[PDB]
């Protein structure tokens with residue numbers, strides 16, 4: 001019993017974070033085998049963030065310009081190269097704590113965990129999702145860029161996010177580990193905004209199913225509706241359309257609970273259309289959307305890793 | 307910018323969790339130097355949870371009844387003993403990954419992090435507080451007992467909680483690491499309940515200060531009130547009294563923000579007395595109480611560990 005925002009154990013990823021310094025800049029990097037990864041605006045100084053040519057600034061630097069410290073031990077760079085918006089520094093030592101790992105690029109609505117870092121030292125770990133506007137509501141301060149996002153699956157570490165920048169509204173933008181940005185953002189200090197966001201409808205239903213598994217139940221009715229008659233009302237409250245494929249993924253949830261998938265839709269239909277009258281689902285007073293169907297089953301049914 | 311429920315990196319504690327089996331029972335244990343810790347109702351079978359005499363059941367067992375596995379490696383017990391409600395099994399190997407560590411017993415209103423475990427394998431990590439009724443709203447399933455709660459402070463690991471049982475309402479009860487229960491609960495399967503809870507008033511003000519640091523500001527007024535005139539209204543909404551000592555601990559928050567401590571009290575006074583009219587503080591629609599003044603400053607100002 002109970003339902004919490006839960007994050008994967010962060011031990012395997014702490015064994016990788018290091019510090020990278022060049023000029024007057026210092027940020028976090030990720031050390032795997034004999035390569036350290038970090039954002040490229042670490043070759044930028046404060047004059048190089050208007051509209052820089054990174055290719056031409058990287059021909060200026062030499063290998064000994066990059067200070068890499070892992071613990072109170074200095075790593076020696078021997079080569080360097082550029083892949084999109086990330087930078088790769090080849091060092092002469094291999095990380096003995098390198099886990100089974102794997103770069104993947106995620107799709108909006110999926111969730112991951114974030115280990116925030118400063119000066120190569122982990123500070124804390126929390127759970128996020130990629131919003132439909134391709135940003136993330138993180139907790140980040142100065143020096144945080146270089147932190148990664150990641151999921152664990154049995155024992156493999158799927159790295160999916162490197163952090164780069166905060167936006168005027170306070171949400172956040174970064175890349176996948178192959179250096180490509182999530183969203184239409186670029187790494188030059190000009191004007192940018194996020195674009196209009198929507199609520200992740202499939203996740204909302206998954207949390208509502210979690211509720212019934214835990215005891216809560218004042219929200220189910222006897223009505224049903226059709227898949228098109230749902231989207232008509234979802235349209236208006238700025239939710240995303242729900243698709244036939246989303247329906248299937250909710251099969252084992254509907255199964256174990258007894259509540260048909262289209263039945264729970266007609267329940268959510270009223271909640272949007274009447275508010276909550278001051279009562280709470282799973283401790284919350286809002287309709288919460290940062291829980292996938294995966295997250296519900298791994299937490300309500302007992303799945304660990306190794 | 308941004309404000310999230312954050313948990314300490316769990317790496318140092320994953321190096322300790324093991325599995326303990328005896329009879330038909332299996333649960334988690336904590337391995338430090340040459341000692342493994344676990345709850346004593348692991349010598350209990352299913353017949354031994356009505357009203358057992360543990361002292362007299364422990365004279366029955368022999369050292370080879372306790373299977374201890376750390377990884378796919380078997381630990382050999384050589385001795386065993388009882389300290390209140392926890393059980394200590396001395397094994398012939400010392401844990402090489404034993405961190406700087408330290409047992410402490412916490413006070414209601416303080417927060418800690420929990421690494422949930424099953425079969426000696428970590429599953430996930432989240433943030434809790436000790437409620438004023440001495441229980442905790444965790445996320446726990448079968449096999450979870452043996453998980454610990456802990457804070458990190460620079461590089462020392464202060465272990466403060468071992469998990470034992472769920473209560474009819476679904477909150478949770480356990481002990482400190484020296485085996486003493488938080489609360490008036492006992493480890494025998496009879497009737498027990500939690501008692502009436504209150505809201506943690508000092509934490510509510512600390513989260514409200516976090517809000518102002520982040521931009522939110524529609525809740526401050528020009529009124530003030532007195533410390534006694536606050537408790538009069540706190541009394542009625544089932545909040546805890548606020549004391550002169552609590553006031554001091556809010557000094558650096560009030561400082562950096564400019565809002566006097568008694569000024570924020572008069573602001574909270576209205577919020578209780580008018581509701582929120584459908585607007586949200588730090589993404590939330592409720593008044594949130596699981597953030598201490600410590601938690602706010604370490605997150606809003608950049609503190610890590612090593």
Ligand SMILES: *[C@@H](O)[C@H](C[C@@H]1CCCNC1=O)NC(=O)[C@H](CC1CCCCC1)NC(=O)[C@@H](NC(=O)OCc1ccccc1)[C@@H](C)OC(C)(C)C
Nearest residue numbers: 049140142143144145164165166167168187188190191192
């Ligand atoms: C990594 O250490 C660091 C983290 C930032 C620091 C402030 C709080 N949160 C963070 O995540 N990232 C940076 O230092 C960014 C610098 C790069 C410059 C070249 C490539 C892009 C990022 N700085 C930022 O994150 C800034 N954001 C930004 O550039 O916004 C785009 C913009 C600019 C002007 C007008 C409109 C939009 C932040 C710190 O500055 C703002 C304006 C967001 C306060």
Ligand SMILES: *[C@@H](O)[C@H](C[C@@H]1CCCNC1=O)NC(=O)[C@H](CC1CCCCC1)NC(=O)[C@@H](NC(=O)OCc1ccccc1)[C@@H](C)OC(C)(C)C
Nearest residue numbers: 355446448449450451470471472473474493494496497498
């Ligand atoms: C540790 O593996 C395990 C975890 C439990 C399992 C269910 C979900 N959540 C959990 O945390 N703990 C136990 O197995 C407990 C057994 C011990 C028995 C002797 C010493 C006390 C605990 N079991 C429980 O946690 C049970 N709780 C309980 O005993 O409640 C007290 C009570 C009993 C009868 C009437 C009133 C009060 C749970 C599983 O059973 C309930 C009744 C809560 C469903």
